């Protein structure tokens, strides 16, 4: 059976908001170690990977591994009604959500009824403020359907083109940095230039409230990895296949 308490309930609200628009239904893989979610979108262009470690929770019990098919819109709606306790019995078709912050609200959510990316190094890795990255993707999606991302040691460029015209955004490698989190840091072994659908990047930037920082990992002819840290708990990775 599974039982976990998260005093910072807000994290779980944000995680769901970051996911529900891209993924309707997913299998939450729960173990002694923590929570795992891996799932592709219905159009098979992208894949999300969530990790929430057991140590990120206040209390946590999982006797043995169990998987729960979760409708993410339903869980979002339930989480919209929120100290959180999650509880699933053995052999059950419901997850129980018990909220707090005398008043107690109990929600019983109905449950529903293989393929993994290998681990690799990347030619070109970019760290930047997450708001800056969200803004860039939002802006450029008003010019075209796709972004060309060019990653070199001195900077990263984003370019779109469409009916109205074209646009180029250049961010330099930051230098005299005041705060760590406002830095634009690039680690380049090989330069890379690849094309990605902006519709999907704007799905990914819904994870912005989780983290002040986003990490972009690229290699030639392989999927883009967009990474958000979940402070003290884990991470959320989005993978996006190139055009």
């Amino acid at each position: 059976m599974f039982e976990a308490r998260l005093v910072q309930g807000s994290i779980l609200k944000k995680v769901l908001e970051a996911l529900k628009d891209l993924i309707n239904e997913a299998c939450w893989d729960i173990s002694s170690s923590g929570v795992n979610l891996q799932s592709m979108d219905s159009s098979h262009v992208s894949l999300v990977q969530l990790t929430l470690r057991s140590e990120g929770f206040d209390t946590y019990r999982c006797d043995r591994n169990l998987a729960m098919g979760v409708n993410l819109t339903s869980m979002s709606k339930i989480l919209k009604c929120a100290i959180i306790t999650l509880r699933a019995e053995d052999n059950a078709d419901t997850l129980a959500l018990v909220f707090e912050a005398e008043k107690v609200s109990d929600y019983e959510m109905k449950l529903m009824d293989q393929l993994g990316i290998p681990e690799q190094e990347y030619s070109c890795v970019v760290k930047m403020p997450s708001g800056e990255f969200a803004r860039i993707c939002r802006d450029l999606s008003h010019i075209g359907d796709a972004v060309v991302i060019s990653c070199a040691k001195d900077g990263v460029k984003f370019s779109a083109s469409g009916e109205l015209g074209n646009g180029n955004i250049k961010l330099s490698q930051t230098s005299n940095v005041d705060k760590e989190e406002e830095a634009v840091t690039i680690e380049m072994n090989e330069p890379v230039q690849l094309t990605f659908a902006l519709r999907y990047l704007n799905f990914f930037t819904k994870a912005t409230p989780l983290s002040s920082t986003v990490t972009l990992s690229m290699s030639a002819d392989v999927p883009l990895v967009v990474e958000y840290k979940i402070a003290d708990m884990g991470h959320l990775k989005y993978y996006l296949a190139p055009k």
Partner: peptide, 7 residues
């Protein structure tokens, strides 16, 4: 297509 990258 991302499937062709997944093992």
């Amino acid at each position: 297509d991302i499937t062709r990258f997944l093992v």
